[model samples]
Target: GPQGYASMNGGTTGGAGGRVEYASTGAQIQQLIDNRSRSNNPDEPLTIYVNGTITQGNSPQSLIDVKNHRGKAHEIKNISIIGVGTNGEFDGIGIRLSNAHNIIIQNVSIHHVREGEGTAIEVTDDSKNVWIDHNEFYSEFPGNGDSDYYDGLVDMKRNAEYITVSWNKFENHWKTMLVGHTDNASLAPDKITYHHNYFNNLNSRVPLIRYADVHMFNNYFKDINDTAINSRVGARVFVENNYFDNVGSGQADPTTGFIKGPVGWFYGSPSTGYWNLRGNVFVNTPNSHLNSTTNFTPPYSYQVQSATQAKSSVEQHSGVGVIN
Candidate 1:
């Protein structure tokens, strides 16, 4: 629970509006996203509840595409898709949310997906106030280092803003969460929060933030072979009370660097946007990987847990409910 967001519901905590929709298959899921393609309104807002396993077939595009309709994509708002009663898994498919706002996705597993280099979930097209929480994401053969098969686990692009991503599990994958891609600010994703998440055996970008201020705290990164945390392009990453284990530049002969930055604490000419690090747990990792001195300042109020306990706290509490 970090700070600097507008309550994540966009001022609708009681939930009197918005209708309910259900989907159990990929086609039904597609229909769920297409329902508001100029649909009616209670229902001015809608939420899709997923209860079973959804396998996107051999379709070349993403499994579910939440897109703008007829050029009024931003008109869609207050949509939520969550797993209820027995965890649901997205098999061989992924999700894309574009040109939408106030969308929430939680408690779902998206794995083995192959959509244009295999991104599990992508949020793009000037979306805002989106919250992603308590999900699982990975690849079928994450060890298979091939761009012909894999991409980011979750990617946010096209200058988005006011987002919160927390309590998710990212495992057995390469190129994890990508915050902003194009290096354009335009007040999009201007503020983001990454907290209480777990990164296991992932390669890089725990998230590569571009032109934004991201607050990262109380997360766990384990068995990371390549770069653990990299912040560049004037992206201020306020890293505190996080744990990093066995994270380095990886083996000398590994195929890497698709959307890559420096080996550690990637800087833009030595702190264009502050890269502050404090009270973090570094296990089997070198302290040289981080240069804590920076210039940017946090715009919100936060209480980072003591680094002495971050590892155990994150390991015990991160990811979907509990895995052990």
Candidate 2:
């Protein structure tokens, strides 16, 4: 089962009481997913164990196309993709989930995507009930100066809801994560939760949000070059119990102009958003500042830890090989 926001909206129980299969290559994984769609029980719970590094285009041109596997009007649902032990990885590959629900991806290391246009994982197109935990995302740093070294580590867009991203390690990446696809303020709200994650040597978007309700807590951020958490386009964020060290801007201003500033470092947006920050600590973050705090409170129950404890806990428990 999933926790945090993912625990809501009917909750996420990926692959429970379902068949289990193993795949070592992208083609094999695609076959397993395709096979399910062909079965009479297209929505049956399915668990896939990835044993080793799976690359792109080995079998099918793309691996694990959730949209292509969608069953009638109901999008593909109830699937779990779990990495096997410490060796599970995706080298130069990206995972995309669109029109999906009740999905889990855990304990994998994904990196080395195509330099100019690559994203580690993306959730979009009305996806819901997704839990991404204990994975690692990174790319070669100091390469091309553009933010396109890798597009995004994990991104959600277009009404993605009830998602939780926890205990993941993101390192040496540019444009780390994006929570929205457009600047339209009238779009449906995106609901997401990020907790107990570790960000190290990252550039920006830890993550940038728009038209969303985001709860970010118990995360550790260090050596952020450009910006940290940002709210935009009528987005509302509840930031709590986080640790920030030597970051460019611990939390960017929740209000700003359109398009990220070349050096704004803090926050960016075309329209105003609100942030309710509680029990968060910032150290050596000269550019950091507090903006207008909102009256928002998270609807779910959760525990809080001091910033010091969050730092140690995230470092010890985040990333691949840390959790079973």
Among these predicted structures, which one has the highest lDDT? Answer: 2
Model 1 Cα displacement at 36 (Å)?
3.1
Tell me how candidate 1 scores on lDDT.
0.66
What TM-score does candidate 2 reach? 0.91
Question: Which pairs, if any, clash in model 1?
Answer: 18-45, 68-73, 160-188, 160-189, 161-189
Mind giving the per-residue lDDT tens digits that candidate 2 earns over 16-77?
A: 78899988888888888888887899889999988978887554745356654554255888
Model 2 misplaced stretches (Cα beyond 4 Å): 57-59, 68-73, 115-117, 186-189, 249-268
* Residue 133 displacement in candidate 1 (angstroms): 0.5
Tens digits of per-residue lDDT, candidate 1, 4-36, equal: 442443432211256777777777767656656
Q: Positional deviation of 90 in candidate 1, in angstroms?
A: 1.0
- Each model's Cα RMSD: 4.3, 3.2
Best candidate (score: TM-score): 2
